[PDB]
Amino acid sequence: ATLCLGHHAVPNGTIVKTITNDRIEVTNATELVQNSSIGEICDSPHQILDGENCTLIDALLGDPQCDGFQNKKWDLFVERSKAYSNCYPYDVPDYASLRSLVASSGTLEFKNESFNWTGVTQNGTSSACIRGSSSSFFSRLNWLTHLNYTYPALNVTMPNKEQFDKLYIWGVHHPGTDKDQIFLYAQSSGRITVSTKRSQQAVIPNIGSRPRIRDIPSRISIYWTIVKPGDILLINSTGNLIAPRGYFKIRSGKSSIMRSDAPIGKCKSECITPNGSIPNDKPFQNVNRITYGACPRYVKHSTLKLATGMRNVPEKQTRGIFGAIAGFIENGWEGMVDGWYGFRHQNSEGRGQAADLKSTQAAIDQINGKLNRLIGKTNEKFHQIEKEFSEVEGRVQDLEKYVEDTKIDLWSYNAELLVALENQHTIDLTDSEMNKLFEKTKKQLRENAEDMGNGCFKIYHKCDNACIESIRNETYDHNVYRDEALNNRFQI
Amino acid sequence: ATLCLGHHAVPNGTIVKTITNDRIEVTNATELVQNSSIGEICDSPHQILDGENCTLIDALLGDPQCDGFQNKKWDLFVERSKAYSNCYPYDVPDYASLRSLVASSGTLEFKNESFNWTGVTQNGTSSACIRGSSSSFFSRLNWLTHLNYTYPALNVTMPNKEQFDKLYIWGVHHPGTDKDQIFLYAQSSGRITVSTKRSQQAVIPNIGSRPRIRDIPSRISIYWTIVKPGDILLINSTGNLIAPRGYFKIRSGKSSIMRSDAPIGKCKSECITPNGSIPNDKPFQNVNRITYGACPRYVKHSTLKLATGMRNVPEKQTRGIFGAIAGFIENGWEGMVDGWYGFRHQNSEGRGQAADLKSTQAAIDQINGKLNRLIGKTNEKFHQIEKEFSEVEGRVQDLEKYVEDTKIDLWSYNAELLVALENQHTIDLTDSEMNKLFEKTKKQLRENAEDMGNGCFKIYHKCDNACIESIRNETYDHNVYRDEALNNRFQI
Amino acid sequence: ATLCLGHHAVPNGTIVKTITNDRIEVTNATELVQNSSIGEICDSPHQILDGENCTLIDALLGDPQCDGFQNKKWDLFVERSKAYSNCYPYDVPDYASLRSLVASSGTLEFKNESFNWTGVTQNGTSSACIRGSSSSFFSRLNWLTHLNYTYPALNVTMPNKEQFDKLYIWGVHHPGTDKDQIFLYAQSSGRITVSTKRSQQAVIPNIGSRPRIRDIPSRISIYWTIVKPGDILLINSTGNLIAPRGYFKIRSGKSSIMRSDAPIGKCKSECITPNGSIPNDKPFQNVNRITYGACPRYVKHSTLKLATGMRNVPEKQTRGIFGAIAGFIENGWEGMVDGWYGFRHQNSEGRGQAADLKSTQAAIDQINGKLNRLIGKTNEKFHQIEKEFSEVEGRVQDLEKYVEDTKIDLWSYNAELLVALENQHTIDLTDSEMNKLFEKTKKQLRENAEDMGNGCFKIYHKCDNACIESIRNETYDHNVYRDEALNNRFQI
């Protein structure tokens, strides 16, 4: 009789990369790079705040347009490119740091405080910042002006006797004329100094016309102070002070901000990009280097195929290290669809085929053990650094860019090497399981059969279907057939 | 006779991770993550300076409390959380950069210089800074005041004609009243400008009361200049100048600073953390991301087990690639305690067991070669970046945090992959050595024995203890027994 | 007859590192670290601009010495250590950021603009900046002075109505005396404020003598503004303004700057270091961490040898996992120079040797597949961060240094692990190909030969040269000789 060992093959193989070859065909493979988004930022499970027409800073200051954002919290604040300011013209020195610390804090929770502004006119107001069809101002800021043509020197204190840090936002007004300076504050100069036990911020206003923003040549420069428990805010002003009305609560947590024009969708996804939410089943992604949540790692490769099956073809230069698959076994069997390894036989009762379940399962379990290491195990990242920039800044920006490029190149290397190593090992382990099955079958047959060199055994006795079945299921008694087999082997 | 090949096993195995399995038991394993400190910073072999009640900046300025730190050097300066300043109230713009450059320099070596302060009163003194029960000041700073109610415009020069850089520390006094400004300096304003060939630092004092620190509403702002050889320091002051008394030597080397409340111990250890000194035998550590010296690399894993022995069990899905261990050899032998591989026999004279030394050693040497790559080869790091922060700063701090998080995640990946790869290879190499021993034994026996399929050979002749011994030690002559063996094999 | 399987060896082996051994000899190996430069910066294929005696900033401002650099472009600007400024003394706040953004832009393209300087004297000039033997000034800057002893308040505007960004360079003059201030500008103070819609830069000059640079105690402080399309530059000055004569075009691209004293050579090389251009065939380099172009990655190792051949020696502790090379095959054959694996025979007609081409090629193809992954696949880097520093700066510099050290250590790890893994696999794959050839030969011979245990087969029949040739080329019919062979094997 004849008993042949073999493995399965498929008509639709997949090309993968290995350590020793750029292009080898395997029976099956899975993609490890996520390359697509559905185009929507899912509203679950992270608390999304669409900024819509407002930036985070405008919502913080209290632009009238952003009145509905009062005391809001978020996991992720989404800034739109269409956003525009429509209150008094302002600048923030170190705007990026203020935007970052508020975004990381994740709250616009504001508590009003009763400051003693004796001797000055409160609630100053402008036609550049109209609220409910009336001239107004930033909701969190108090513009102070002269009362009875006098602005006395202010020396106003507020202690932090709480158990949490207080974030104070205040500003300095720069009029476009000496005339407006006199009209507003009486005083010719003006000067603002705010202090804590640990800090001093001293600002001297600059009178002068700047290019008009929405017809306004004057500006407000915005500053912030953090006052910890047991510390005290102290505000000296001889004019030009845009006063705080209280403090923001500042928290620490997982909160962040992202620039994106993707719509908010009614859906659930853990990983957010500016292109929209992405699946996180895969370990790597090519969609965006800017991410929030439990996200695949950004890599530069567009595709990385992990082999999830054996080799599909013979090829000498990538043949497994044991030399069975693509080796002494000439080809796989497309007609074996119930297992990865198996037996074909020819006897007196005909020709048959049967899969080996134990070797098939042993190969599958090893491949699944690789998949369990790589699939569905992404790591959470929240507030990070900015990675896209609208203006030239030089040295700090060069550093932020370099850090991200360095990180991406290292992760792109890790991903490439991982796939090449795993694929080489997957091809070698599947070759190994075939070789083990052949060796086990050979030992079983003892002196009753000879290797024909092609994965087939010439069995030197009469072996019916039950006899072939006994070999396949490990119950073959060689002693039963040994005399018949030895006579047939050793003759003339 | 019967001769069986086998391997050792133990009752107390250890679970490790591989490429293809999350949980596999091996005979032995070693821990690669250091997770503990003894709680003391060892005083050897690095030169430790305990700052005790003083910060590095207070010791630099010459707070009276820190007079014993004059001209000290260190490899590592240790700042305590209990530390407090008890001289005149001061701030430093870019305090972190000054603290860093002094810490990296590693010396408080100070050389006095004779500045020409003609026309002003020297050695100004305060009740806020008492030394030996007398009102005093910072030991390295010279407070200048009016003489005869006049403060002439100063224009004082000092050349660097040395061969080393000079670090000058100076300050600006901000009085809390215009009255104190007049009393001290005569002049209503005051102004300080210090220059080199390459730099200018122009400071305008700010008169005004700040929140009181130890009853003092006024402040001194501290600045520094570095003057290189062939350059010149030039100091213009029309008042408010806190003058230097000389320069600090500035060096480059391995020096650093660390925040820690761990006691200094009388001991010797190369790696220092804020939690105390740690062993550096292991390649990785989980104790602290802040380190100094020849230290294991910080990783996020709490444990990483490297297999140092073979597989302890049979398991089909992780059976070695050669298929002997956990394969056709059903189980290991707990009663073999003199070697990792060996022989068991049954003959006419009884049953015995003996270890194979050459295969045992070949496996051990390979595992030791892995250990030699990983154990006791840590790399020295000294002055780095700060990694814990007491205040919100925004953009720069976001970057410093991101750089460290990026580095830790990459090293944590390297450590995880290394263990999984090495463990897979260790299991495969130990399976290989077993297979090689079996194959070598098979070839030795020629036609005188048959494989029974379980790692045992049925020897078809009479083989006494000396005959079994000859097989084990490679002196078996097959030709001697061939006729006897062939007759027994090939019969009816 | 006797047929022996074997492999080649060489007299001049090369030591490599593996996973399990520090020192193993292989037949051949290639170097993966580039350690040398030819000492010249090649002028091709990147556009080189030698700055010679000029810095990039001096060429930008228009030092007379740098007049030949007007409107130049470059891929790489080369600054020399011999470079020196010979116009009016200047400083740049954030000099490093300005130098960086211009270097990255890669162009000195300048367009003159007609500013309305009504009421002031234009084209101010100095003996500190002589051009063609006449007193002059920076070519891109316009020094404004009083006209008729009056300096009216300037309020000068320039819109960007183009489609590209404009880079404006301007300055502030600080006279060394109040007298020179009056002589030049009439006004006692002077003040400069330049604004856009988005920015304000307000500079107050500081009257005062600094240490003389080439006999000059006064200074010009340089500032820059970028004005985007639809934005407007606005310049207010009441004195001391060093005016722009137009704008620089600003671009984005692959341009950079490098400090180097290496000569420019007439040659072609893609990778530039400060030490000179380097070959980029190798994946790693030890020459410099500062690079430009398609460059090998900087690593700390001086040498890394990748094995490109099999093991050259027997050694038990690193013997391949199949146990043929350095195993049951006692040694290689130095006399086999036509292939890596082969046959030696002894028969009735003599003794011979012949190489196996198919196994030799299979090993070579796998090794070449590794080489194709590592050789000639370097990645392009252009403008990065600075990595060498001439002055102490503290925190930002600590961060830039830490980022680079972190990156180098990670790449140095990747390179070390790659070589150790590849070399282990190369030794194992070459052992595998030897084992496959032996196993294939064994199956071919069937019952006509016996393994002697040393890679040699005892063939139990008369096998002439044509019979040996038939075995080597896969046409051996075992059935022809089986009766003769069985009689000789199984006798007394």
Tab-separated table of C-alpha atoms in Angstrom, chain C residues 103-432:
chain	number	residue	atom	x	y	z
C	103	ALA	CA	18.373	77.852	6.801
C	104	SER	CA	15.209	75.708	6.437
C	105	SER	CA	13.803	78.252	3.917
C	106	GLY	CA	16.894	77.800	1.746
C	107	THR	CA	16.829	81.141	-0.019
C	108	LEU	CA	18.141	84.700	0.342
C	109	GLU	CA	15.742	85.955	-2.413
C	110	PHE	CA	15.029	89.596	-1.594
C	111	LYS	CA	12.524	92.015	-3.103
C	112	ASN	CA	12.934	95.744	-2.459
C	113	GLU	CA	9.856	97.690	-1.350
C	114	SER	CA	9.176	101.415	-1.537
C	115	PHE	CA	8.482	102.519	2.029
C	116	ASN	CA	7.397	106.105	2.645
C	117	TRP	CA	10.102	107.511	4.960
C	118	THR	CA	8.904	111.158	4.647
C	119	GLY	CA	10.552	113.484	7.155
C	120	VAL	CA	13.750	111.544	7.912
C	121	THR	CA	17.250	111.149	6.408
C	122	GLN	CA	17.733	107.771	4.693
C	123	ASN	CA	20.792	105.615	3.991
C	124	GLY	CA	22.644	106.222	7.279
C	125	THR	CA	26.175	104.979	7.168
C	126	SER	CA	29.122	104.056	9.404
C	127	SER	CA	32.940	103.693	9.398
C	128	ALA	CA	32.402	100.335	11.179
C	129	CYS	CA	30.947	98.929	7.948
C	130	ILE	CA	33.065	99.926	4.941
C	131	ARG	CA	32.037	98.580	1.504
C	132	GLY	CA	34.041	99.669	-1.597
C	133	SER	CA	36.447	101.733	0.533
C	134	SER	CA	33.559	104.047	1.473
C	135	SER	CA	31.647	104.097	4.776
C	136	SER	CA	28.435	102.112	4.415
C	137	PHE	CA	25.942	99.825	6.144
C	138	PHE	CA	24.070	96.485	5.875
C	139	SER	CA	22.743	96.161	2.285
C	140	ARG	CA	19.243	95.057	3.354
C	141	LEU	CA	18.822	97.631	6.129
C	142	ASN	CA	18.097	101.358	5.946
C	143	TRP	CA	19.413	103.458	8.794
C	144	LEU	CA	17.061	106.426	9.354
C	145	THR	CA	18.247	109.659	11.055
C	146	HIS	CA	16.824	113.169	11.646
C	147	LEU	CA	16.240	115.588	8.774
C	148	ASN	CA	16.598	119.310	9.637
C	149	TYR	CA	17.043	118.321	13.330
C	150	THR	CA	13.540	116.770	13.511
C	151	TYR	CA	12.466	113.134	13.594
C	152	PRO	CA	8.633	113.129	13.159
C	153	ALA	CA	6.595	110.197	14.484
C	154	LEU	CA	6.545	107.566	11.734
C	155	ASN	CA	3.436	105.506	10.993
C	156	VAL	CA	4.387	103.526	7.896
C	157	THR	CA	2.358	100.676	6.369
C	158	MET	CA	3.016	97.931	3.849
C	159	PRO	CA	0.290	95.385	2.863
C	160	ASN	CA	0.940	91.825	1.759
C	161	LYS	CA	-1.258	91.553	-1.366
C	162	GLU	CA	0.868	88.703	-2.757
C	163	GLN	CA	0.235	84.936	-2.501
C	164	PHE	CA	3.368	84.128	-0.482
C	165	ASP	CA	4.621	84.983	3.001
C	166	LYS	CA	7.058	87.875	3.466
C	167	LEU	CA	9.970	87.780	5.895
C	168	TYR	CA	10.872	91.283	7.149
C	169	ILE	CA	14.201	91.866	8.947
C	170	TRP	CA	14.619	95.118	10.913
C	171	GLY	CA	16.548	96.414	13.913
C	172	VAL	CA	16.864	98.852	16.784
C	173	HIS	CA	19.929	101.026	17.341
C	174	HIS	CA	21.253	101.499	20.883
C	175	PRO	CA	23.729	104.482	20.954
C	176	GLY	CA	26.521	104.481	23.558
C	177	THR	CA	25.752	108.039	24.686
C	178	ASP	CA	22.742	110.338	25.105
C	179	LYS	CA	24.821	112.696	22.916
C	180	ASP	CA	24.903	110.272	19.906
C	181	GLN	CA	21.161	109.674	20.442
C	182	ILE	CA	20.516	113.449	20.091
C	183	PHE	CA	22.972	113.791	17.175
C	184	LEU	CA	21.334	110.937	15.236
C	185	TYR	CA	17.631	111.167	16.078
C	186	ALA	CA	17.121	114.584	17.817
C	187	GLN	CA	14.725	112.930	20.303
C	188	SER	CA	16.032	112.029	23.786
C	189	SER	CA	14.470	108.531	23.975
C	190	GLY	CA	13.220	106.882	20.754
C	191	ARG	CA	10.835	103.965	20.507
C	192	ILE	CA	10.013	101.327	17.874
C	193	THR	CA	6.795	99.372	17.474
C	194	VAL	CA	6.082	97.105	14.510
C	195	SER	CA	2.743	95.381	14.207
C	196	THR	CA	0.628	93.058	12.078
C	197	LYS	CA	-3.023	92.107	12.532
C	198	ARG	CA	-1.816	89.192	14.714
C	199	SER	CA	1.422	90.474	16.352
C	200	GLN	CA	3.138	93.407	18.021
C	201	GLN	CA	6.857	93.833	18.641
C	202	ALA	CA	7.535	96.884	20.816
C	203	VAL	CA	11.204	97.706	21.443
C	204	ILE	CA	12.562	100.470	23.669
C	205	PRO	CA	16.263	101.272	22.898
C	206	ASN	CA	18.807	101.239	25.723
C	207	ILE	CA	21.314	104.079	25.692
C	208	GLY	CA	24.616	102.935	27.150
C	209	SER	CA	28.161	101.878	26.394
C	210	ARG	CA	28.846	98.164	26.079
C	211	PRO	CA	32.347	96.548	25.763
C	212	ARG	CA	33.775	97.572	22.409
C	213	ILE	CA	33.494	95.173	19.437
C	214	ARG	CA	36.028	96.428	16.842
C	215	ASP	CA	36.128	99.782	18.647
C	216	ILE	CA	32.305	100.192	18.802
C	217	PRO	CA	30.534	100.442	22.230
C	218	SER	CA	27.033	100.714	20.686
C	219	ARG	CA	24.825	97.977	19.210
C	220	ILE	CA	22.002	97.108	16.845
C	221	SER	CA	19.464	94.538	18.079
C	222	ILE	CA	17.878	92.576	15.160
C	223	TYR	CA	14.265	91.405	14.987
C	224	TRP	CA	12.119	89.706	12.355
C	225	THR	CA	8.411	89.592	11.393
C	226	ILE	CA	6.544	87.314	9.030
C	227	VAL	CA	3.601	88.880	7.188
C	228	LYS	CA	1.179	86.484	5.443
C	229	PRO	CA	-1.145	87.346	2.467
C	230	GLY	CA	-3.981	89.733	3.492
C	231	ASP	CA	-1.981	90.907	6.535
C	232	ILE	CA	-0.211	94.278	6.820
C	233	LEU	CA	3.095	95.406	8.296
C	234	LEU	CA	2.828	98.649	10.308
C	235	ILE	CA	5.970	100.462	11.582
C	236	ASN	CA	5.715	103.173	14.255
C	237	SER	CA	9.011	104.803	15.189
C	238	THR	CA	9.860	107.915	17.211
C	239	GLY	CA	13.591	107.201	16.675
C	240	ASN	CA	16.299	104.509	16.637
C	241	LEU	CA	14.728	102.420	13.879
C	242	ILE	CA	16.931	100.409	11.560
C	243	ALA	CA	14.434	100.054	8.740
C	244	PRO	CA	13.962	97.180	6.227
C	245	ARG	CA	14.432	97.907	2.500
C	246	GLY	CA	12.003	95.150	1.503
C	247	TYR	CA	11.270	91.555	2.339
C	248	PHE	CA	12.846	88.141	1.966
C	249	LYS	CA	10.898	85.404	0.272
C	250	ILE	CA	10.344	82.506	2.664
C	251	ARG	CA	9.975	78.956	1.353
C	252	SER	CA	9.484	75.501	2.781
C	253	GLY	CA	11.608	72.597	1.598
C	254	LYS	CA	14.540	70.316	2.284
C	255	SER	CA	17.082	73.048	3.024
C	256	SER	CA	19.382	73.171	6.079
C	257	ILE	CA	22.615	74.531	7.553
C	258	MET	CA	25.691	72.754	8.930
C	259	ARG	CA	28.820	73.849	10.789
C	260	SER	CA	31.942	72.320	9.196
C	261	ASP	CA	35.536	73.144	8.242
C	262	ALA	CA	35.744	70.292	5.670
C	263	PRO	CA	36.687	71.519	2.103
C	264	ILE	CA	34.131	71.375	-0.717
C	265	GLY	CA	35.145	68.673	-3.234
C	266	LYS	CA	34.230	68.118	-6.863
C	267	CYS	CA	32.431	64.815	-6.306
C	268	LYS	CA	29.036	63.150	-5.895
C	269	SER	CA	27.718	61.792	-2.575
C	270	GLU	CA	24.202	61.766	-1.062
C	271	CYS	CA	25.165	61.820	2.638
C	272	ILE	CA	26.966	64.811	4.171
C	273	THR	CA	28.507	64.984	7.681
C	274	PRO	CA	30.640	67.809	9.214
C	275	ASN	CA	33.588	65.411	8.800
C	276	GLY	CA	32.848	65.265	5.032
C	277	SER	CA	30.631	63.180	2.788
C	278	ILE	CA	30.220	59.455	3.647
C	279	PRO	CA	29.121	56.369	1.606
C	280	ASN	CA	25.503	55.308	2.312
C	281	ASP	CA	25.693	51.587	1.313
C	282	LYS	CA	25.744	50.623	5.005
C	283	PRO	CA	22.653	50.985	7.264
C	284	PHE	CA	24.626	52.465	10.186
C	285	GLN	CA	27.470	54.925	10.737
C	286	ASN	CA	29.804	56.027	13.536
C	287	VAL	CA	31.148	59.215	11.899
C	288	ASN	CA	28.826	61.930	13.172
C	289	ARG	CA	25.351	62.339	14.720
C	290	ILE	CA	24.962	65.480	12.547
C	291	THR	CA	23.979	64.449	9.019
C	292	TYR	CA	22.208	65.760	5.918
C	293	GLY	CA	20.713	63.696	3.041
C	294	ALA	CA	20.178	59.963	2.514
C	295	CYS	CA	22.380	58.852	5.400
C	296	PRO	CA	23.095	55.717	7.449
C	297	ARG	CA	21.778	55.927	11.008
C	298	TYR	CA	24.181	57.109	13.712
C	299	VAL	CA	25.031	54.388	16.262
C	300	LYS	CA	27.572	54.219	19.086
C	301	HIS	CA	29.183	50.945	17.957
C	302	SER	CA	32.428	51.206	16.022
C	303	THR	CA	31.863	47.885	14.170
C	304	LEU	CA	28.966	45.525	13.603
C	305	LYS	CA	29.661	42.392	11.568
C	306	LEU	CA	26.854	40.682	9.706
C	307	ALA	CA	27.625	37.038	8.848
C	308	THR	CA	27.331	36.336	5.106
C	309	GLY	CA	28.424	32.728	5.272
C	310	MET	CA	28.183	29.623	7.359
C	311	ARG	CA	30.092	28.773	10.445
C	312	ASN	CA	33.830	28.125	9.701
C	313	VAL	CA	34.671	25.918	12.752
C	314	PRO	CA	33.293	23.197	15.074
C	315	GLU	CA	32.194	24.635	18.507
C	316	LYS	CA	29.775	22.780	20.627
C	317	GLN	CA	28.091	25.686	22.426
C	318	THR	CA	27.133	27.455	19.137
C	319	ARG	CA	26.584	24.528	16.925
C	320	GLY	CA	23.594	25.050	14.648
C	321	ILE	CA	20.242	23.778	15.836
C	322	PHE	CA	20.160	20.885	13.291
C	323	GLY	CA	23.513	19.543	14.435
C	324	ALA	CA	25.215	18.960	11.079
C	325	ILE	CA	27.674	21.896	10.717
C	326	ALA	CA	30.006	21.828	13.729
C	327	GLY	CA	28.121	18.666	14.681
C	328	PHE	CA	28.080	15.219	13.189
C	329	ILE	CA	30.069	16.662	10.272
C	330	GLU	CA	33.450	16.995	12.003
C	331	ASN	CA	34.858	19.831	9.897
C	332	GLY	CA	34.485	21.782	6.659
C	333	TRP	CA	36.513	21.279	3.493
C	334	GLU	CA	38.973	24.039	2.503
C	335	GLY	CA	39.581	22.255	-0.811
C	336	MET	CA	35.960	22.836	-1.875
C	337	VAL	CA	36.090	26.272	-3.573
C	338	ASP	CA	33.311	25.809	-6.201
C	339	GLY	CA	30.407	25.540	-3.730
C	340	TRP	CA	29.332	25.686	-0.108
C	341	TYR	CA	28.046	22.129	0.155
C	342	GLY	CA	29.039	19.002	-1.711
C	343	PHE	CA	29.945	15.378	-1.970
C	344	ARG	CA	33.176	13.470	-1.534
C	345	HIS	CA	33.295	9.853	-2.609
C	346	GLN	CA	35.511	6.801	-2.652
C	347	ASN	CA	34.859	3.948	-5.075
C	348	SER	CA	36.689	1.427	-7.310
C	349	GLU	CA	37.778	4.178	-9.755
C	350	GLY	CA	39.238	6.459	-7.024
C	351	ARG	CA	38.366	9.374	-4.773
C	352	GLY	CA	36.549	12.540	-5.900
C	353	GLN	CA	34.865	15.752	-4.817
C	354	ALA	CA	31.939	17.641	-6.362
C	355	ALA	CA	29.863	20.652	-5.202
C	356	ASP	CA	26.028	20.650	-4.856
C	357	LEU	CA	24.807	23.776	-6.678
C	358	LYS	CA	21.169	23.726	-5.599
C	359	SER	CA	21.830	23.701	-1.790
C	360	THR	CA	24.715	26.236	-2.259
C	361	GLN	CA	22.372	28.577	-4.147
C	362	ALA	CA	19.513	28.113	-1.618
C	363	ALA	CA	21.784	29.295	1.236
C	364	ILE	CA	23.205	32.206	-0.867
C	365	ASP	CA	19.715	33.402	-1.948
C	366	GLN	CA	18.570	33.565	1.744
C	367	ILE	CA	21.674	35.525	2.792
C	368	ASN	CA	21.244	37.890	-0.198
C	369	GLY	CA	17.607	38.391	0.910
C	370	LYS	CA	18.907	39.594	4.283
C	371	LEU	CA	21.467	41.845	2.571
C	372	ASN	CA	18.759	43.351	0.316
C	373	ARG	CA	16.871	44.372	3.462
C	374	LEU	CA	19.907	46.148	5.012
C	375	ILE	CA	22.184	47.379	2.187
C	376	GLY	CA	21.404	50.501	0.146
C	377	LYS	CA	18.109	51.516	1.785
C	378	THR	CA	19.010	54.590	3.869
C	379	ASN	CA	16.370	57.239	4.679
C	380	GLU	CA	16.591	60.958	3.875
C	381	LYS	CA	16.808	63.533	6.661
C	382	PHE	CA	17.217	67.261	6.091
C	383	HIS	CA	16.667	70.114	8.618
C	384	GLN	CA	16.745	68.729	12.170
C	385	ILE	CA	17.796	70.092	15.585
C	386	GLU	CA	21.210	71.372	16.660
C	387	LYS	CA	23.354	68.719	18.371
C	388	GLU	CA	26.491	70.650	19.377
C	389	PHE	CA	26.394	73.835	21.426
C	390	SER	CA	29.003	76.518	22.119
C	391	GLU	CA	27.272	78.114	25.161
C	392	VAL	CA	25.491	76.947	28.327
C	393	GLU	CA	21.720	77.581	28.100
C	394	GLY	CA	20.123	75.154	30.608
C	395	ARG	CA	16.640	73.745	30.108
C	396	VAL	CA	15.995	73.865	26.322
C	397	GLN	CA	19.531	72.634	25.570
C	398	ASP	CA	19.181	69.826	28.172
C	399	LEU	CA	16.054	68.755	26.299
C	400	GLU	CA	17.679	68.894	22.794
C	401	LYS	CA	20.653	66.857	24.103
C	402	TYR	CA	18.407	64.325	25.895
C	403	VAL	CA	16.254	63.786	22.772
C	404	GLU	CA	19.324	63.019	20.640
C	405	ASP	CA	20.989	60.751	23.303
C	406	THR	CA	17.653	58.853	23.684
C	407	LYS	CA	17.387	58.380	19.898
C	408	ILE	CA	21.015	57.196	19.495
C	409	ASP	CA	20.723	54.653	22.355
C	410	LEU	CA	17.510	53.202	20.789
C	411	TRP	CA	19.076	52.934	17.298
C	412	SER	CA	22.303	51.478	18.819
C	413	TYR	CA	20.108	48.820	20.536
C	414	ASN	CA	18.246	48.081	17.247
C	415	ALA	CA	21.530	47.649	15.365
C	416	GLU	CA	23.086	45.343	18.041
C	417	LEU	CA	19.996	43.124	18.295
C	418	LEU	CA	19.573	42.968	14.507
C	419	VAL	CA	23.117	41.675	13.947
C	420	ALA	CA	22.920	39.146	16.808
C	421	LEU	CA	19.522	37.800	15.569
C	422	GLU	CA	20.502	37.715	11.886
C	423	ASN	CA	23.831	36.029	12.607
C	424	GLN	CA	22.159	33.339	14.753
C	425	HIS	CA	19.606	32.758	11.974
C	426	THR	CA	22.338	32.739	9.231
C	427	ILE	CA	24.304	30.054	11.134
C	428	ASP	CA	21.080	28.035	11.677
C	429	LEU	CA	19.894	28.333	8.002
C	430	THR	CA	23.319	27.221	6.677
C	431	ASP	CA	23.273	24.243	9.114
C	432	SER	CA	19.706	23.510	7.867
